[PDB]
């Protein structure tokens, strides 16, 4: 619960371009959002495991 | 190349969607009643609601009881478990027959289990325990938990490893720079071998030099493997094995089979019910088939009288080929097919039928197609005739010698001369007893 708050905030903020390979290829801060989303999902499913 | 042993000509009952059996289908010619009853039994078993039912098949030999049993087994499919059994197989020497037949009863039904595990791979560089810089006053800092950075080319992580998984690592005697494979839950350790980097170090080495398998460090896989009930029964009653010395001794203790108590079975049943509530597993029914039942001991009949009463009893199909016969293990207990009436009260009787000349011709030509052997019309007529007057089995046995006599004559077809020569070189039971009647010394 404490993690998917940040996960959904990030998804609503930059979930349409950070997850996109093209936008994340050349963007100073959009890849930061992309990798933060990947990391929070990874901790989410690892905690579930 | 192609091997055939009196079977593989039948691909199940192959009945219509309405349940009506057509004249010729799947190695079956005619025999509408038995095939329809067998399809009804298939409808019984596929209902997945009822248990404890049973049926016996009756009739004279060579009528296809084995054929029908194999047909129902085939149409059920490999996924549906099946346990073949012979009457002579029940009589064992280690434990009384009741345990063996309960074992078969449990073996009948199966259960598929959903499971998920974790996959890890990479080469090894680190063999260090937890440093534990803080002594805390209780630790001379050291632990049997070797922290290894799992050096895969795509990822690396330092793991606090159990003493058992590190002991298995020591079993492989791993050094720096070699691919390893470990499990999150079980901790199973297997190495594909040393890396190809160290291949040039030694001009020769028994250890195989292998490349690093491609893939991420942490990988997750799921299995829905189907395991029958009695494999779990024996595993629970007796642990299967382990790499450790304690497990070696434990499996060295008692490897022979003995009885199975019901308490463990009921606990397993309850945990399986918990799983099906969770949806992890789903049960499937079972079928048990017994061969040549007339010889069974009266004690076996009495016990099977109550075996079907149990809620865990699956459908058991039965075959017998006797008339007014006394029950084995008895003296005056005589009944049809040599079975006490108390058993057959709950059973259903189905009877096979004989066949007409056209049926013998059809089965003979189907066999000839099965062994890809071509025959002439006159030889086909002779085979069908002599099968009608002697037996189907004798004709089936001498089918191959006819083709062999054709081949040694450089002929691809069986002629009248071929079957005549086969009859010259082979004799059936009738002329066997005719010859043995006029015997100097039991010729």
């Amino acid at each position: 619960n404490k993690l998917r708050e940040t996960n959904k905030q990030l998804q609503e903020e930059f979930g349409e371009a950070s997850f996109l390979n093209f936008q994340d290829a050349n963007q100073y801060f959009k890849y930061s959002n992309k990798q933060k989303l990947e990391g929070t999902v990874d901790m989410l499913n690892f905690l579930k495991m | 190349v192609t091997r055939t042993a009196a079977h593989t000509h039948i691909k199940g009952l192959g009945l219509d969607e309405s349940g009506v059996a057509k004249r010729v289908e799947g190695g079956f010619v005619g025999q509408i009643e038995a095939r329809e009853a067998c399809g009804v039994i298939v409808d019984l078993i596929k209902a997945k609601k009822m248990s404890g039912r049973a049926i016996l098949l009756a009739g004279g030999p060579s009528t296809g009881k084995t054929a029908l049993a194999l047909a129902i087994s085939q149409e059920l499919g490999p996924k549906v478990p099946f346990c073949p059994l012979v009457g002579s197989e029940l009589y064992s020497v280690e434990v009384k027959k009741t345990e063996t037949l309960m074992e078969n009863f449990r073996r009948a039904i199966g259960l598929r289990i959903k499971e998920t595990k974790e996959v890890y791979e990479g080469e090894v560089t680190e063999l260090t325990p937890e440093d534990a810089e803080n002594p805390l006053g209780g630790y001379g800092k050291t632990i049997s938990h070797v922290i290894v950075g799992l050096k895969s080319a795509k990822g690396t992580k330092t793991l606090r490893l159990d003493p058992t998984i590190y002991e298995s690592i020591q079993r492989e005697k791993v050094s720096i720079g070699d691919v390893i494979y470990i499990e999150a839950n079980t901790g199973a350790v297997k190495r594909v071998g040393r890396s190809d980097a160290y291949a040039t170090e030694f001009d020769l080495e028994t250890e195989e030099y292998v490349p690093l398998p491609k893939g991420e460090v942490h990988k997750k896989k799921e299995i829905v493997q189907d395991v029958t009930l009695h494999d779990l029964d024996v595993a629970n009653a007796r642990p299967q094995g382990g790499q450790d010395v304690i497990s070696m001794m434990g499996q060295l203790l008692k490897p022979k089979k003995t009885e199975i108590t019901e308490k463990l079975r009921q606990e397993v049943n309850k945990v399986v019910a918990k799983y099906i509530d969770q949806g992890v597993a789903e049960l499937i029914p079972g079928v048990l088939f017994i061969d040549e039942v007339n010889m069974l001991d009266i004690e076996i009949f009495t016990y099977l009288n109550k075996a079907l009463e149990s809620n865990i009893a699956p459908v058991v199909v039965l075959a017998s080929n006797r008339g007014m016969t006394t029950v084995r293990g008895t003296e005056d207990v005589i009944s049809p097919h040599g079975v006490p009436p108390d058993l057959i009260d709950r059973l259903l009787i189905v009877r096979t039928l004989p066949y007409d000349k056209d049926e013998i011709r059809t089965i003979i030509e189907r066999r000839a197609t099965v062994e890809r052997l071509q025959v002439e019309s006159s030889a086909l007529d002779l085979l069908a005739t002599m099968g009608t007057e002697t037996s189907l089995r004798y004709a089936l046995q001498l089918l191959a010698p006819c083709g062999i006599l054709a081949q040694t004559s450089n002929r691809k077809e069986i002629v009248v001369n071929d079957v005549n020569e086969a009859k010259l070189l082979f004799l059936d039971a009738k002329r066997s007893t005719k010859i043995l009647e006029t015997s100097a010394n039991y010729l």
Partner: protein, 447 residues
């Protein structure tokens, strides 16, 4: 509900159909009729519940399919759980590895059960920190460890022997452990949830349970339902539980049986352990050996003799092990110390009610005239045959897909599957077709 829901032979009967005054309703509880048999069975059940006297036997007399096994299992169900009920067969007792007398001894032992209670005093608490002066002073400096719970927390001194004890089962704090107050044995349960993120993958040892709630040390009594036979097994062997599961009892000698009986008496007079009345049931006892009969006659007079239930459909016939005959195929010595219950075949009303309740158990919807013709078959045939007929007719109907089982549906089901009478007629008229007893059978078809 915990057992399999698969429909057994009698999945419609659950318990006993009697009232408080032991009067059976004509149709109740799932079993119909046998009013005198139901009342007698309830008398036996009430006496078992009483348990004041023992060393008695009871037998039921009736033809096959009359309800002997049905009544026995209904009595067992009405008995309920936690009361040891043992059901065995007269055939399985013939053990090639165990003596029949010894097997009967275990059969009697398993029927009776004992309840044993035990009180425990353990200290449960999550450890906060451990500080031992193992270097400044060394030699078990009697360090102090703090232990927390969700409601209270105290600091406990550690003695030299406690220093040595904590040297084993090493705990780095941040972990929930419990120590027995009496024996001082510490058990490491599992860490706190804060340790879940130390590493991604951990072995099967690390666990993260909640902090214990309440006071530090608590008192709790534990009651065990342990019958005599398993105690015999565990006392016979260093590890008797494996012999219990595998069944390799090894023919336990009777020398330890007197010792275990004396220990049971000591626990009873001390109040530590109490006994529970038990019921033993054997089906189709008509087949049995005379050694078993003599041993049963002997053991029926012992104090540890639970009520024994017999079922038999045999008339006056020969007993196995002897050449001569006897009533019920059973020796008169057993009949001397026994009470016999008579059961009879059901009438057409009882038969149709049984068919209706069995169809309801099978969840098979039927027609009125279909029920009438099924009852006609059941009265012409045996009762167990019409149940199978309607069972098969259910799938034939769903093949026809027209909801209820039809009249022509049952007719075709009967046509496809031979009755015992039709099977016997077919065998007799075609004895040449079948392999006769003598070993002669006609194989040729053409004449």
């Amino acid at each position: 509900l915990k057992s399999l829901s698969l429909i057994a032979a009698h999945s419609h009967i659950t318990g006993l159909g009697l009232d408080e005054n032991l009067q059976p309703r004509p149709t109740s509880e799932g079993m119909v009729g046998q009013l005198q048999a139901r009342r007698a069975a309830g008398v036996i059940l009430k006496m078992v519940q009483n348990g004041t006297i023992a060393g008695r036997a009871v037998l039921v007399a009736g033809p096959p399919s009359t309800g002997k096994t049905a009544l026995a299992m209904g009595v067992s169900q009405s008995l309920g759980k936690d009361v040891p009920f043992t059901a065995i067969a007269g055939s399985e007792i013939f053990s090639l590895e165990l003596s029949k007398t010894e097997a009967l001894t275990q059969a009697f032992r398993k029927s009776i059960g004992i309840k044993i209670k035990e009180e425990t005093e353990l200290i449960e608490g999550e450890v906060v920190e451990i500080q031992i002066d193992r270097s400044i002073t060394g030699g078990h400096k009697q360090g102090k460890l703090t232990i927390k719970t969700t409601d209270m927390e105290t600091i406990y001194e550690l003695g030299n022997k406690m220093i040595d004890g904590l040297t084993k089962e090493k705990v780095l704090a941040g972990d929930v452990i419990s120590i027995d107050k009496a024996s001082g044995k510490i058990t490491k349960l599992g860490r706190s949830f804060a340790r879940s993120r130390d590493y991604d993958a951990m072995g099967a040892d690390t666990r993260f349970v909640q902090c214990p709630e309440g006071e530090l040390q608590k008192r709790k009594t534990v009651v065990h339902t342990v019958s005599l036979h398993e105690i015999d097994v565990i006392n016979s062997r260093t590890q008797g539980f494996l012999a219990l599961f595998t069944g390799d009892t090894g023919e336990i000698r009777s020398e330890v049986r007197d010792q275990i009986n004396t220990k049971v008496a000591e626990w009873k007079e001390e109040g530590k352990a109490e006994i529970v009345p038990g019921v033993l049931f054997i089906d189709e006892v008509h087949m049995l050996d005379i050694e078993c009969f003599s041993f049963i006659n002997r053991a029926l007079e012992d104090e540890f003799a639970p009520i024994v239930m017999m079922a038999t459909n045999r008339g006056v016939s020969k007993t196995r092990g002897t050449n001569y005959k006897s009533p019920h195929g059973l020796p008169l010595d057993l009949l001397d110390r026994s009470i016999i219950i008579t059961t009879k075949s059901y009438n057409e009303q009882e038969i149709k009610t049984i068919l209706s309740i069995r169809a309801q158990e099978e969840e098979v919807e039927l027609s009125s005239d279909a029920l009438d013709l099924l009852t006609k078959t059941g009265v012409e045939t045996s009762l167990r045959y019409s149940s199978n007929l309607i069972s098969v007719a259910q799938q034939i109907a769903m093949k026809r897909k027209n909801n209820t089982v039809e009249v022509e549906d049952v007719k075709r089901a009967y046509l496809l599957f031979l009755d015992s009478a039709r099977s016997v007629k077919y065998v007799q008229e075609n004895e040449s077709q079948y392999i006769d007893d003598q070993g002669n059978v006609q194989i040729s078809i053409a004449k």
